[PDB]
Design a protein around this ligand. Sequence first.
Ligand SMILES: Cc1ccc(C(=O)N2CCN(C(=O)NCc3cccnc3)CC2)o1
Length: 119
Amino acid sequence: YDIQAWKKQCEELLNLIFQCEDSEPFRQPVDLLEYPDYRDIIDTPMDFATVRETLEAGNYESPMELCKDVRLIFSNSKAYTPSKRSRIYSMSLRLSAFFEEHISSVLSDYKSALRFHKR
Ligand SMILES: Cc1ccc(C(=O)N2CCN(C(=O)NCc3cccnc3)CC2)o1
C-alpha cells in the first residue's frame, strides 16, 4: 500500500529497458537528416531518455502518466513504420510486450495503494 513505490519500480524497469538491445532506436530523438519526414508523420515525439528524465525531474504524478508516454513511443513507431515487418517497428513490438508485462503489477499496486489510502 506504498503509494510512492511505483517511482523506483519504474526506474528499475527503465534500467531493464535500456539494457535491452530492442530499445536502442527509442533512447533518443529521430535525426531529421536520417528521417526527414518524421515530424510530418509524428506530432509528439517521445523516447525513453525523455521518460527517464521526466520521472527523475519529479514530473510524473502517477505510473499511468509514465505508461502513456511509453505507449506513445510505441504508437509513434507504428505510425512511422513503412511496413509492419520493418526492423525498428519489430523491435518496438517486442519491447512493448516486455514493457506491458512488467508495468501491469506497477499500475495494479499503485491503484490498490491509492484505493487503500482513500478507503
Ligand atoms: C524505419 C522505422 C520504423 C519505425 C521507426 C521508428 O519508430 N523510428 C524512426 C527511427 N528512430 C530513430 O532514428 N531513433 C533515434 C536514434 C538515433 C541514433 C541512434 N539510435 C536512435 C526511432 C523511431 O523507424
